[PDB]
């Protein structure tokens, strides 16, 4: 029942492509339809979802598919970069960088402030 509608939409193709290939006349009158298609086949020989695209349309379809590939990958990358786990990881890595940068700034600005105080004293 979780896949009932998917199974129905799957069997829709089977019935549609089955009943497209059947002759027009019902099963009793398939004899007449077989005689008409056999007469057409003998006249042509003894005397629906397969659109055969041209070369330029094939190139346009290929370019459309390549564009769809690129926007799908850009959307996947943007969804990965906007998720909470990647944001938490990049924030923790950045704060790892900041704690060291602020510690260096403080530990060397102490020497800068001491040098400024000594220069103000010796002036």
């Amino acid at each position: 029942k979780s896949i009932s509608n998917q199974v129905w939409k799957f069997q829709r193709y089977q019935l549609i492509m089955t009943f497209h290939e059947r002759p027009v006349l019902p099963p009793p009158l398939i004899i007449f339809s077989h005689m008409t298609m056999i007469f057409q086949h003998l006249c042509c020989r003894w005397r629906g979802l397969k659109l055969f695209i041209t070369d330029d349309e094939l190139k346009k379809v290929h370019d459309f598919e390549e564009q769809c590939i690129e926007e799908y990958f850009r959307e996947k990358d943007d969804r990965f970069n906007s998720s909470n786990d990647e944001r938490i990881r990049v924030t923790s890595e950045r704060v790892e960088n900041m704690s060291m940068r602020l510690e260096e700034v403080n530990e060397r600005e102490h020497s800068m402030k001491a040098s400024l105080q000594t220069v103000d004293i010796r002036l």
């Binding site: 564009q67 690129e70 926007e71 850009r74």
Partner: protein, 331 residues
């Protein structure tokens, strides 16, 4: 020689004695290396040609429709560096404006300076937007690779670190080689680019919202030639607006630090004027004798402050300033 080439490598008329020959170097470039493969057409054009033939070429012979914007990328020639997200914000705003307006980007073309930032901006785009470059023919690396009529020549990203010649940016969609007959010398592309930009601006657009096809010139860093072309742009007919992007130093920082404290152009106080003169003389190491000349050239620029637009970063990309200048310089 005076043309800079080898003494045996031979084969304006003032000291170079040139003769006008038919063109031979035009076709397409197959960019191998540097990531993605990109095809970019090229036509070698003399520096003294008429711009209407270049217009006919760019419309019909190149299958490029007329844009709604001309985003010029005039900047510093030598290679510089920027803040990382300043470059990222500038690149994202540039590509956003370029896809919203369908613009042609008139970037310099050789891979040094602000052109290196524009090619990195197209890496952020990564997937139309013409990038017609106007670089001199004599400065390009592997000139012999570029010879050949209608031939898809291979062009590697082979850049020798000590060579004077500069390889092109591989991510430009189109190229134009300004040939004055010499090699390794700049200035062969400037006048052709200015007359081409004015010939673009004289063509009437289909919408005709403003005055033909509008032009927006973007400036990052630059020397005194940047100030000279800013004066040439502001005093032009029509007066094309100029966006400058500060935070980069050089002439753009001087222009923005003036423009924040200029009021009615020449309404600058004495201490700020002396500070601007001493930063011109010392911070960017210009001569102090020409510092006053650069100051009055700056004031002649500043007499038309309604078209100069700046960008202070601090979200809020440069496309806002580009579209603001687009609405400003449209009449």
């Amino acid at each position: 020689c005076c043309c800079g080439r080898l003494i045996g490598q031979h084969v304006w008329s003032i000291s170079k004695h040139t003769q006008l020959s038919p063109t031979d170097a035009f076709g397409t470039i197959e960019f191998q290396g540097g990531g993605h493969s990109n095809k970019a057409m090229y036509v070698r054009v003399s520096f003294d040609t008429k711009p209407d033939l270049l217009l006919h070429l760019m419309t019909k012979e190149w299958q490029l429709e007329l844009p709604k914007l001309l985003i010029s990328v005039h900047g510093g020639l030598q290679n510089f560096e920027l803040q990382p997200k300043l470059k990222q914000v500038f690149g994202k705003g540039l590509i956003k404006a370029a896809m919203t307006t369908g613009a042609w980007i008139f970037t310099g073309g050789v891979n040094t300076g602000v052109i290196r930032h524009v090619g990195d901006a197209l890496k952020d785009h990564a997937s139309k937007i013409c990038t017609i470059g106007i670089a001199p023919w004599g400065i390009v690396e592997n000139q012999e690779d570029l010879i050949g009529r209608d031939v898809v020549r291979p062009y590697q990203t082979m850049s020798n670190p000590m060579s004077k010649l500069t390889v092109l940016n591989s991510m430009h969609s189109h190229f134009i080689l300004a040939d004055n007959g010499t090699t390794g010398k700049y200035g062969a592309e400037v006048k052709l680019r200015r007359q081409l930009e004015k010939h673009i601006s004289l063509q009437k657009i289909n919408t005709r919202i403003g005055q033909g096809v509008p032009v927006v010139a973007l400036i990052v860093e630059g020397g005194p030639n940047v100030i000279s072309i800013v004066l040439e742009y502001l005093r032009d007919t029509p007066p094309v607006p100029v966006v400058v992007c500060d935070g980069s130093g050089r002439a753009s920082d001087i222009l923005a630090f003036g423009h924040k404290y200029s009021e009615e152009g020449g309404l600058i106080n004495e201490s700020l004027r002396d500070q601007l003169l001493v930063t011109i003389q010392k911070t960017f190491t210009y001569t102090r004798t020409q510092a006053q000349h650069l100051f009055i050239i700056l004031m002649e620029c500043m007499k038309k402050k309604e078209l100069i637009t700046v960008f202070r970063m601090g979200h809020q990309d440069i496309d806002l300033a580009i579209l603001t200048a687009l609405l400003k310089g449209a009449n």
